[PDB]
Each structure stands twice: as C-alpha cells, then as structure tokens.
Amino acid sequence: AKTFTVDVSSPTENGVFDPASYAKYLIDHIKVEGAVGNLGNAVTVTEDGTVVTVVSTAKFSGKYLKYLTKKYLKKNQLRDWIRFVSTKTNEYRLAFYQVTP
Amino acid sequence: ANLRTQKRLAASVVGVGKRKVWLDPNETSEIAQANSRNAIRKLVKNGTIVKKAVTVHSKSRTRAHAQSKREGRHSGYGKRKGTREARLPSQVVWIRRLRVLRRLLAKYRDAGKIDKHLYHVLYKESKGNAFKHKRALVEHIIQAKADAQRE
C-alpha cells in the first residue's frame, strides 16, 4: 500500500477552510481505472480535523493529490492565497502565501 | 535611474537571459544601490528579483495527431507529397526482408529442421526473389521436406 498525509491546520484555524468538505470532494473526484465510483477496498480518505489522510493500494500519486487539492481550492476561490506543498515525502500541507501588511 | 547593469548581472547570475529576469519597480533605489553580484544574489533570495518560469510549448496536439497516425489516419494521397521511395526506400525494405530470411534459415539449419544443402539452395533463392516473406519461405520448406520424405 501507499500512504499520503495532508495537513490543514493553518487555513482551518483562521477560518477559511473545512477539512470535511475537502475530503467530501476527494472521495468522489478520485478516479480508479476510469471514472468516479470505483473506490472498492482500494482507497480510504479519512480526516481528523487537523490532518487529512489517504491510503491507496491502487495507482495514486502526490501530483494527483496536489492536482485535486488545487482544483478544490479553485472551486472555493482559494488558489490565489493558499498553496499545497510537501514538507516531507508523502507528507504535504496547505500554507498561505507571503502576504505582509 | 538606470538598472541596465543590474538586469544584465541578474541574468548572468541566475543563469537565464535578460528577457526572463524581473525587477520589482517599487524597490528601485534598493536595486540601483547594487553594483555587485553578491548584492544581486541577496536581492534574488529576498524576493526583489525572480526568475520568470518558462514560456510553454505544449505537445498535446502533436501527441494526439501522432496517435491518430498510429491508428492509421492522415495518410491518403492528399496528404502524401513525396514519392514512395523518399517516404520509405525499397532498398531499406529489401534489406529488412533479406536479413529476416537469412536469419530464419540460419536458425533452422542450426536447430536441425533442415540440412545444409537445402539451406544452400534456399539461400540463393532468397537472395533472388520467389520468397516474399517468412510465410512463403516456411511453406516452401514444408513442401520440400514433405516431398523428400514422400520420395
């Protein structure tokens, strides 16, 4: 298997983000062998409130995860302020840009 | 002011052309103070001078057209504009074919499916034509062996 781990503390604390909607987006928009609706025993998306987590036996990659997360942020109008980054291998997190006063 | 030297030096430092490098117009005095590559590096890291990532050249269309060509499209007489030879030399075709026929006969002789004398006559017949491909050569071999055991 393969595990991937997103952290959502930064935006969620300041009140722009809800991890449950992000996981609700991921769990349906993730594709396996074609289109939506094939996550049978292969993939498991689960949140804690501060950390979202994905576990996949099927084809899944950090670039795919970043692609989905950026799509969600563009949906909720957050692409121009937040970026999905890697802090460690398969350990990613959302982070604001360098906005200063 | 005049940041020509600074643009040149920033290009030479970052390892790109001047067409890429970017000077924020607000930090003009801070850039004009710089007359050294160390200072330009400081301005590169602090965020006053950046790199301007590459102008793209996508190949989605080219890959799609190539896939359609693999599937056998865009090949008709209205798309052909050079001769059949210029597109594919008959010399190349004959080379492939004759190498194939030589290799097959060598393998058969080494395995023991055929003797050296029949190999020798087939070598020169395949050097000539009357063996158009692997199938015809195999069928001729089968006919030969069958009439031989019939005799």
Partner: protein, 50 residues
C-alpha cells in the same frame, strides 16, 4: 458571473507570450484578502491578530 470570470481571466492570462509569474515569490497586501474573504463569507478576526 461565469461569463464575468471568463472575461476577467482573458485579460489576466496572456499566456502565449510570457509565462504568468509564480505566486511563491510575489507578495500581496492585507486588505485585499480582507475584501476577498469577506466577499466569500469568512471573518477576519483570526487574521487581524496576526
């Protein structure tokens, strides 16, 4: 509003020439994101502290 978004991005992009700047390196104001997130329906009491 979808048409307005398309029209805005048409001016914003200009992509066949010069490869839009990355946001990693740029810096934006505060007040801009205030207006943006107020329009989105969030409140900035957690950001004002900061």
């Amino acid at each position: 509003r979808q048409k307005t978004m398309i029209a805005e991005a048409r001016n914003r992009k200009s992509l066949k020439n010069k490869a839009i700047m990355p946001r990693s390196k740029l810096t934006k104001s505060f007040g801009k994101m205030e207006e943006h997130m107020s329009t989105l329906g969030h409140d900035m009491s957690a950001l004002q502290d900061k």
